[PDB]
Design a protein around this ligand. Structure first.
Ligand SMILES: CC(C)(C)c1cc(C(C)(C)C)c2c(c1)[C@@](O)(C(F)(F)F)C(=O)O2
Lengths: 51, 261, 131
């Protein structure tokens, strides 16, 4: 069950990366965008590898 | 890209013909008579036709010409449609009979596969006689090549298209998609049945799932990526090639691995 | 090495509004670097390598056949769906750069489908017996 909790953590991390794609610049400044463009990579890859 | 995928499709049709020859070489002399060999070899010839339909997809004004174009468009349409029909209707017939006889006689199988193929051919023919396919050119924005030759290039791209596509094509895609989803559902429902009259319903279920997934993926992508010739051609070609390769192997290599002891 | 900075591109100045007398130049914000393909390729290479070793070891354990923890069918199906859908998504997203809505819809549906499948095919077979 602990590995199952790990894979559910990975799945919810990957779900959390949906929002960080639609943010384009009409909702975000010009400096937060460049950090979102790497936090979404972080989140997606670690969620997938964890699961 | 064109010649590489054509070599791939040629090897595919070679393997399909070899395999159909093998399966008919042991028609009833062994247990192969259990798993209906007519449905399996109909599937094999359907995959062969669908793989042969790759060459008309790659032939454009670089090779053929303007007057030989409505033959290439017709080859595309008829080969692809009839090949998909003959290579999916057999598996759908197999799985549908496996379903409905467990919730029989071998002539109803041929009756219903003929019904499916006839429906597909009749609807494709009525579409083609109402609004036939003809050559159409679509133009891009002007650009400037700077080889110091001092000329402006107007890049153009031509493709087979009827008067009002994206409507008849939409109807064909939706009808085939609902058929594919019914195939997936029936294959999932009857994975536990262990009929002895039909031997390999689990293999046709796996092949149906694969073909349906790849087709439902590559059907709208090709419509979206239409204005890029390489992307659309590579997507359609690789979908056909991989689906046919995998359905051939998963449908036949267990038979020749069990028969060879 | 490549901090993946922000770059903006512009094109097609001539488009016009409903008649308000403006030349609306549309521009689009992106996140590229010098060599995006190399880094994305090595990332996908590592992920595909672990995927391949997982599929190998799941096939090697196919014949345990205990009704409680065999579950190699689910590993196979999930890795197949994930592999094919992520390859298609990574190919399509690069080919639709100049269409933000289509790119976003494609990648969002890919992520949603892959994650929900790799979750259901692991958790729903348990909770269907406990009833
Ligand atoms: C190939 C086919 C017969 C169509 C099939 C389809 C499914 C779906 C539930 C995803 C529809 C499926 C299986 C087989 C599995 O037996 C397994 F093998 F993947 F595990 C399973 O439980 O799920």
């Amino acid at each position: 069950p602990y590995m199952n909790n790990l894979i559910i953590l990975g799945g919810m991390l990957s779900y959390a990366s949906i929002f960080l794609f639609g943010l384009d610049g009409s909702f975000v400044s010009e400096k937060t965008f460049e950090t979102l463009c790497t936090v979404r990579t972080w989140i997606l890859t670690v969620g997938y590898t964890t699961a | 890209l064109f010649i590489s995928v054509s070599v791939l499709s040629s090897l595919g049709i070679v393997l399909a013909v070899v395999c159909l020859s093998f399966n008919i070489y042991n028609s009833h002399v062994r247990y192969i008579q259990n798993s209906q060999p007519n449905l399996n070899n109909l599937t094999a010839v359907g995959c062969s036709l669908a793989l042969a339909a790759v060459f008309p997809l790659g032939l454009d004004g670089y090779h053929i010409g303007r007057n030989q174009f409505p033959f290439v468009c017709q080859a595309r349409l008829w080969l692809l449609g009839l090949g998909f029909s003959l290579g999916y209707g057999s598996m759908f017939t197999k799985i549908w009979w496996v379903h409905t006889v467990f919730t029989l006689e071998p002539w109803k199988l041929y009756a219903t596969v003929g019904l499916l193929v006839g429906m597909d051919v009749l609807t494709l023919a009525i579409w083609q006689i109402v609004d036939p396919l003809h050559r159409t050119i679509e133009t891009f924005a002007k650009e400037e090549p700077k080889e110091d030759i001092d000329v402006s290039i107007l890049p153009q791209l031509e493709h087979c298209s009827s008067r009002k596509m994206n409507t008849w094509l939409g109807i064909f895609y939706g009808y085939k998609g609902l058929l594919l989803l019914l195939g997936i559902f029936l294959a999932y429902e009857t994975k536990s049945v262990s009929t002895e009259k039909i031997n390999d319903h689990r293999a046709v279920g796996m092949a149906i799932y694969n073909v349906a997934v790849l087709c439902l993926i590559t059907a709208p992508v090709t419509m979206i990526l239409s204005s890029q010739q390489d992307a659309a051609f590579a997507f359609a070609s690789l979908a056909i090639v991989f689906s046919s390769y995998i359905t051939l192997v998963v449908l036949f290599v267990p038979k020749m691995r069990r028969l060879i002891t | 090495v490549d901090p993946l900075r922000r770059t903006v591109e512009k094109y097609s100045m001539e488009p016009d509004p409903a008649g308000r007398d403006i030349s609306i130049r549309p521009l689009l914000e992106h996140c590229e670097n010098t060599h995006m393909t190399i880094w994305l390729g090595i990332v996908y290479a590592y992920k595909g390598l672990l995927m391949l070793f997982g599929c190998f070891l799941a096939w090697e354990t196919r014949n345990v056949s205990i009704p409680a923890l065999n579950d190699s069918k689910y590993i196979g199906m999930s890795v197949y769906n994930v592999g094919i859908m992520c390859i298609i998504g990574a190919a399509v997203s690069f080919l639709t750069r100049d269409q933000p809505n289509v790119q976003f819809c494609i990648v969002a549906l890919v992520i949603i489908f892959c994650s929900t499948i790799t979750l259901c095919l692991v958790f729903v077979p348990k909770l269907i017996t406990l009833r």
